[model samples]
Target: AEKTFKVVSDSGIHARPATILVQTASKWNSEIQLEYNGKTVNLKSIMGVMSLGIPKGATIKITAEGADAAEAMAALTDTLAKEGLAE
Candidate 1:
């Protein structure tokens, strides 16, 4: 499963938010990947996410596979929206 999201936060996906995302993802069994600027990284990895240097107004594509894919994507997007990271 996959979904595209627009990053609305001015600070982008910084350390704190990334930690939240990773923590959320860690709860799921599905494999999740976040894509930006033509690169993809494991959403469960803090360093991988931080290295992306995601900034405001960026477009992100999240892809996941497994039986829990849908649930993970929904929760992830919901959290991003709640965090002001995306809408």
Candidate 2:
């Protein structure tokens, strides 16, 4: 399963927010990937997420696959909105 979000935060997905995302993704057994600018990286990896250098106005997609895919997507969606990082 997958969902897309357009980054709305002025700071984008910087270190702190990236850490939160990675932490959230790591909680699930499903595999999650974050895609940006045509590149994809494991969402559970803080370094991988940070390396993306996502910026405001950038559109990103999150993909999850496994037994807990749906739950993972839901959690991530909430996190993104709660952090005001994307919409």
Candidate 3:
């Protein structure tokens, strides 16, 4: 399953934020993907995530495909909204 989340708050995808995002994505058996501007990339790589240069207000397409995809997506959204990627 997949869900698209947007950066509604400020702060953008900076180094610290990217680190948290990557960390949040790692706690699941599902493989995750982050998409921006039609380009999709893995969510496990800090460098790759940071390289996307996703800024504030950018909408990210998140996909989790595996046994725990739904759970992973929910957890990720909660993490992002609470901290890391958002202010």
For candidate 2, what is the TM-score?
A: 0.58
What stretches of model 1 exceed 4 Å from their correct place? 54-87
State which candidate has the highest lDDT: 2
Cα lDDT tens digits for candidate 2, 2-86: 9999889987667898888899999999999999866799999988877876568968999999999999999999999999999
Alpha-carbon TM-score of each model against the true structure: 0.58, 0.58, 0.55
- For model 1, how does the per-residue alpha-carbon lDDT over 1-87 read when each residue is reduced to its tens digit? 999998799886678988998999989989999998667999988888878765688688989999999999999999998998887
Cα lDDT, all candidates: 0.87, 0.88, 0.80
Per-residue lDDT of model 3, residues 1-87, tens digit only: 988787765765678878888999998878999988556788988877767665577577888999999999899989997887853
Give the CA lDDT, 0 to 100, for residue 51 in model 1. 85
> Best TM-score goes to which candidate?
2
